[PDB]
Amino acid sequence: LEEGKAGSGLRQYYLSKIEELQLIVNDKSQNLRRLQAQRNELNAKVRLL
Amino acid sequence: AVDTAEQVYISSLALLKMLKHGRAGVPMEVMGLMLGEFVDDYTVRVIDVFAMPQSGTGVSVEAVDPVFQAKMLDMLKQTGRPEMVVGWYHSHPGFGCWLSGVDINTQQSFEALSERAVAVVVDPIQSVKGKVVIDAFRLINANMMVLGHEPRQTTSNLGHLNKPSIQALIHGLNRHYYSITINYRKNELEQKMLLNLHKKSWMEGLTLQDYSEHCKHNESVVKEMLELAKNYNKAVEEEDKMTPEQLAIKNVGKQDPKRHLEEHVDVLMTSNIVQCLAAMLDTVVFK
Amino acid sequence: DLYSRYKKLQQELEFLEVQEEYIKDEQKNLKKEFLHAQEEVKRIQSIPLVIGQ
Amino acid sequence: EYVETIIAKCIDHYTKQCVENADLPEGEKKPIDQRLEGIVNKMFQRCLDDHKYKQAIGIALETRRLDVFEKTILESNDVPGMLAYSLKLCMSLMQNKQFRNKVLRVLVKIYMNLEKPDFINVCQCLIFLDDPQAVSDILEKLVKEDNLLMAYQICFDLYESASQQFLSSVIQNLRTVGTPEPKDQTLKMIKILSGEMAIELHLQFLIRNNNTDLMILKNTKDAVRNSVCHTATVIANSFMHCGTTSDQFLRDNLEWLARATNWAKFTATASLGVIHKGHEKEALQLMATYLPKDTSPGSAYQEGGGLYALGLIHANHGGDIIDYLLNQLKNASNDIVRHGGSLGLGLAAMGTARQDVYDLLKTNLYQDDAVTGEAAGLALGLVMLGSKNAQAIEDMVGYAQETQHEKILRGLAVGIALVMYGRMEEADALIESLCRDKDPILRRSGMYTVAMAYCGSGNNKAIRRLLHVAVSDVNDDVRRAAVESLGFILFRTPEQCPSVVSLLSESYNPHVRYGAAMALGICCAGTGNKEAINLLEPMTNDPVNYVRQGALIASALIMIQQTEITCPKVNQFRQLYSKVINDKHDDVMAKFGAILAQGILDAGGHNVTISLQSRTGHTHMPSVVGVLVFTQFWFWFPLSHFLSLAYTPTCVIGLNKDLKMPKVQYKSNCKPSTFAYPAPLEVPSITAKAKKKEKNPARVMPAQLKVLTMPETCRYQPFKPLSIGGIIILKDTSEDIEELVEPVAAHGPKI
Ligand SMILES: [Zn+2]
């Protein structure tokens, strides 16, 4: 045996690094969508003007 | 006793004819006639729109010459314009787009033939050049005061009809006087002909003429704009030298409405013309 | 559940990856609308006007 | 380290080549060395010594190999858990249907060889593959097994959902089998394809479970207006009185309905068609009894509403009166039989794909009128479900640009939108070609068309141009009509929607806010996700009435089937109740969508609800159609009457025999007071047993299906262990006297 804990274990650790890349894409989506809310709120503000 | 949900189709023909007619929209009362074809109950389309000669009386039923109206309409019938009249338009400068007693009387007299009788009032005198929002008017029946005022279905477009929300005219005179929604239409020939015509109206003849003018004006005229641009940059940096003191004291709250950032970003955008046109000079010098 | 988290998570990889070009479109288009409305409210300010106090 | 890295990259590149060669079954096949199969299958078999019950089907599916998983299920414990976990993993990987159907059609050969066949695997497969060769065996094995009780479940749910035209084919496939146990197989095959027993039991418990309050209807009469909300009052009354055939509320006075000659009477008669449904004699007799004096009604909206209401009653019924509706449609009349007759006839003939209704429908739309062509499109999309005629699409898109009316373009827009179902691999060039059209209405028709085509979250490509046209395009038509396809394809996961539409909650223009409100309304409907509920508070307060209307509708689609003790809904209940008292200072349409939103929760007296998918995970076609046409009320408000097609009552069935009704009483592991009804004002820790008896099963939350516990002292017990809610039968364990037969009801509001 020693595959699900070692081979699939390092595959699961690589999946955790993939979760880190999805944390970079995740928080890039977060701050990009917050800046998107800022520009949307400013252009919506001059629309209210 | 039946009513539907009508909507007035407005093409660029009637629009531009009401814009030239608005340029000729002198304070003196003017007259106009709309044409089109009635295909069904709840739709109306305007195609032909012309102007009428002014008169000292102004907007009135006596000013409408039946032999002149029928003469010009007949001359449109011998040509490729087989459309009947659908309504009459005019201009109301200064006192608002509302309709006086004479206008509602000649409307009552002119609505005996056409049941729809579309009425449009253009007023570009006090309207800013940012918006050209125009509204079409209608006449309600005097016998409908007992029942509901407007039994019009499809109440969704009323939100788009709420854009003219002046607090004196619409509901200041809304009794016995309502309005109707307006939409537009544009085919591919108007889209590409007018789109390419406007892009060309903002472009050059050969499109290569005025490029080298600015590419070589960057060395003669823009240098003054770059030196003055640096004079504004330093003129803000003299205050940005004092900013780290306040930012080093309070750090709480913002009191100056000036951002000092986006203006410099725009200065960089104007300064990037040298970079973008340097490759243009590289192409002109190369081949 | 242990091994299914990989391939089940791949759907979240695609669902979060598809938002990149989307937020690119929003950040590239909404600023064009920002300069559209900006110049539209800028051109309202006309030179002919009355001076008050 | 070295060995695990070379076998790690060796397996990664192995399955990489398996993906590169999985989509190309024949031609230009890349050569694969045998030693790679040896070293991958060697450590793979080393993992398959005990299989660790986790990676067998996982790695067996990642390699995309034919016989890699047949040897895995040979020595394995809990075979139903291995096939249920197998299909559970297969349904969550966003398959392309190229291999899923083969894996299922090869994994259905294992249970027939076992000691007993299972139903969850044949259901969960027959909801996806939809192949006739996979049902011809199981339909003829029912005679060989000579077991009547086990066939009633599979027949009830296969005839219930997962197919319409495949059922139209399997009804004649089973009609051919048998005589042209002979005496028992005849009543079996006849009684299984009936389908009216469900309408009878639903009419029974739904006829004896109604709960009405004078505060709601009295409040509507207090807030009723003669112009706009008059249709909202009768559509809310049709919502609350759906199925119960309670015309006694509309029998109070006649001066409140026929007081105005307009479409309000058409929506009132259509609402009456929403009230009562499933009647072969009392429907036509009730419509004819209204004015059987001169055979000339002064208002033709009663007749048009009789045809449209009749089409609402006979939807998907087997005893359709279509043959008479052709001779009644042959009569020449002004737009009533055209519009209402086209809608009713097309709804009654939905899925038949008959060329006759196609011909008379075409000659009905050949008059260039926008209304009869709109109803002709709405009916043609329904009747052409799955037909995919060659000249029909080109005839409709060719008929679109040659006219100036807009209702014909939206009617043919929904017409060519609903016809496209299951054409994922086909409509790519059609929708991609029709996406660049100059007409904005047809641009909306491409998204509405691709909505139902890509259901199941099977395509991550269409969202690129859906949001790209939602943000990039300057016209708000495709912008507010864009994200409905996004919710229709992403209806599977309720959590992932508000994370990507939260930006669209407060968008630039109010049109994307309204369409996004419809998106939150359709994506979170029937669920309990608070990710939209916590965002509803900013949606309900804005100077624009659009986001307020769609905010009240989206808030109305989530609060249904929810208890207060679980989540604090007092905020949206109070702000939803303050709209009918605040209607004096609000807009005329804001109160329309307000009371129209209030009719959603009171629909059916909390008994009936809606559902976007079935129990096996497959989605209902008339539910998606009903919710999309329900969202199509913006252009034409009377189109909201199709919401009754999406009403899926939540209950259980313990019917043992077709004519014998037993009594099953289980117990719940939760508190009975937490699941009670929120009784309104008058305005003049464990239960011993459940309240479901004589099976009148009441409403049941999907979360309540895990806390049910069958009593060990119960006299009767089915053969299949009742784990999740659905349609099952009861097995007589005692096989003795005193079956406890109960009588049937009598004449009244129903038949
Ligand atoms: Zn004047």
UniProtKB/Swiss-Prot annotation, chain A:
Signal peptide: none annotated. It is found in: Cytoplasm; Nucleus. It comes from the Eukaryota. Belongs to the AAA ATPase family. Component of the 26S proteasome, a multiprotein complex involved in the ATP-dependent degradation of ubiquitinated proteins. This complex plays a key role in the maintenance of protein homeostasis by removing misfolded or damaged proteins, which could impair cellular functions, and by removing proteins whose functions are no longer required. Therefore, the proteasome participates in numerous cellular processes, including cell cycle progression, apoptosis, or DNA damage repair. Component of the 19S proteasome regulatory particle complex. The 26S proteasome consists of a 20S core particle (CP) and two 19S regulatory subunits (RP). The regulatory particle is made of a lid composed of 9 subunits, a base containing 6 ATPases including PSMC5 and few additional components. Component of a complex with USP49 and RUVBL1. Interacts with PRPF19. Interacts with TRIM5. Interacts with NDC80. Interacts with PAAF1. Interacts, in vitro, with the thyroid hormone receptor (in a thyroid hormone T3-dependent manner) and with retinoid X receptor (RXR). Interacts with ERCC6. This is 26S proteasome regulatory subunit 8. It comes from Homo sapiens.
Swiss-Prot record, chain B:
Residues 8-143 form the MPN domain. The modification Phosphothreonine is found at residue 243. One of its GO terms (molecular function) is metal-dependent deubiquitinase activity. Its EC number is 3.4.19.-. A motif (JAMM motif) lies at residues 90-103. Keywords: DNA damage, DNA repair, Hydrolase, Metal-binding, Metalloprotease, Phosphoprotein, Protease, Proteasome, Ubl conjugation pathway, Zinc. Signal peptide: none annotated. It is an enzyme of class 3 (hydrolase). GO terms for cellular component: cytosol; cytosolic proteasome complex; extracellular region; ficolin-1-rich granule lumen; nucleoplasm; nucleus; proteasome accessory complex; proteasome complex. Zn(2+) binds at residues 90, 92, 103. The modification Phosphoserine is found at residues 127, 201. Widely expressed. Highest levels in heart and skeletal muscle. GO terms for biological process: double-strand break repair via homologous recombination; double-strand break repair via nonhomologous end joining; proteasome-mediated ubiquitin-dependent protein catabolic process; protein deubiquitination; protein K63-linked deubiquitination; regulation of proteasomal protein catabolic process; response to ethanol; ubiquitin-dependent protein catabolic process. Component of the 19S proteasome regulatory particle complex. The 26S proteasome consists of a 20S core particle (CP) and two 19S regulatory subunits (RP). The regulatory particle is made of a lid composed of 9 subunits including PSMD4, a base containing 6 ATPases and few additional components. Within the complex, PSMD4 interacts with subunit PSMD7 through their respective MPN domain. Interacts with TXNL1. It comes from Homo sapiens (Human).
Swiss-Prot record, chain C:
It is found in: Cytoplasm; Nucleus. Transmembrane segments: none annotated. It comes from the Eukaryota. Belongs to the AAA ATPase family. Component of the 19S proteasome regulatory particle complex. The 26S proteasome consists of a 20S core particle (CP) and two 19S regulatory subunits (RP). The regulatory particle is made of a lid composed of 9 subunits, a base containing 6 ATPases including PSMC4 and few additional components. Interacts with NR1I3. Interacts with PAAF1. Interacts with TRIM5. Interacts with ZFAND1. Component of the 26S proteasome, a multiprotein complex involved in the ATP-dependent degradation of ubiquitinated proteins. This complex plays a key role in the maintenance of protein homeostasis by removing misfolded or damaged proteins, which could impair cellular functions, and by removing proteins whose functions are no longer required. Therefore, the proteasome participates in numerous cellular processes, including cell cycle progression, apoptosis, or DNA damage repair. This is 26S proteasome regulatory subunit 6B. The lineage of its organism: Eukaryota, Metazoa, Chordata, Craniata, Vertebrata. The gene is PSMC4. The chain holds residues 39 to 91 of 418 of the full protein.
UniProtKB/Swiss-Prot annotation, chain D:
The keyword Transmembrane does not apply. Coiled coil: none annotated. The modification Phosphoserine is found at residue 685. GO terms for biological process: proteasome-mediated ubiquitin-dependent protein catabolic process; regulation of protein catabolic process. The modification N6-acetyllysine is found at residue 584. GO terms for cellular component: azurophil granule lumen; cytosol; extracellular region; membrane; nucleoplasm; nucleus; proteasome accessory complex; proteasome complex. PC repeats lie at residues 267-300, 305-338, 340-374, 375-409, 411-444, 445-480, 481-513, 515-549, 550-590, 593-625. SUPFAM superfamilies: ARM repeat. Keywords: Acetylation, Phosphoprotein, Proteasome, Repeat. InterPro entries: 26S_Psome_Rpn2, ARM-like, ARM-type_fold, Proteasome/cyclosome_rpt, PSMD1_RPN2_N, RPN2_C. GO terms for molecular function: enzyme regulator activity; ubiquitin protein ligase binding. The modification Phosphothreonine is found at residue 179. Belongs to the proteasome subunit S1 family. Component of the 26S proteasome, a multiprotein complex involved in the ATP-dependent degradation of ubiquitinated proteins. This complex plays a key role in the maintenance of protein homeostasis by removing misfolded or damaged proteins, which could impair cellular functions, and by removing proteins whose functions are no longer required. Therefore, the proteasome participates in numerous cellular processes, including cell cycle progression, apoptosis, or DNA damage repair. This is 26S proteasome non-ATPase regulatory subunit 1.
